[PDB]
Amino acid sequence: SGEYTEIALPFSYDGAGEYYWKTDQFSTDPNDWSRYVNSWNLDLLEINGTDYTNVWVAQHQIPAASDGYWYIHYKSGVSWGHVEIK
Numbered sequence: 604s605g606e607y608t609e610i611a612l613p614f615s616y617d618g619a620g621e622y623y624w625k626t627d628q629f630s631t632d633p634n635d636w637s638r639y640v641n642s643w644n645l646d647l648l649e650i651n652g653t654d655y656t657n658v659w660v661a662q663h664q665i666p667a668a669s670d671g672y673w674y675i676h677y678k679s680g681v682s683w684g685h686v687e688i689k
Contacts (some may be wrong), residue, residue, distance in 0.1 A: 607674060612638075614688040616677070624675045626688075630662040638662045638689040646679040648686060662689070 604673045605623030612628040630638035641659045648656045651668050665671060677686060 605676060607675065609659075610675075611672045612688055617683065617685050619679050619682050620676070621679075622675075622677045624677065625672045626675075627667075627672050629667070629673045629688075631667070634654065635663055636661050640665070640688050642684075642686040644684045645679050645683050645686070646684075647676060648650065649676045650674065660678060 605621075607623040610624045610626050612626055614624070614626075616622075624684040638651065639659055639661050640655055642649070642655070643657050645656050647654070650665050651674055653665070655665070665673065674687070677684070
């Protein structure tokens, strides 16, 4: 449980802390491999209930929640936590 802040894509962030971001802008096209989520140096990156910590994954591989959103929960313990969402 976290209070989510809405974000726009493309998105990038590099930093420490624990954040709850939501968007309705992910790619839903199975043909697309340009619009990815990528991260490293994270303790957690979970999106809609699935662990995507420290991986490259195409957005189309991640279904929307029933409400049409993608709920992204980020945790980094270091300065250099990294996430990119195209």
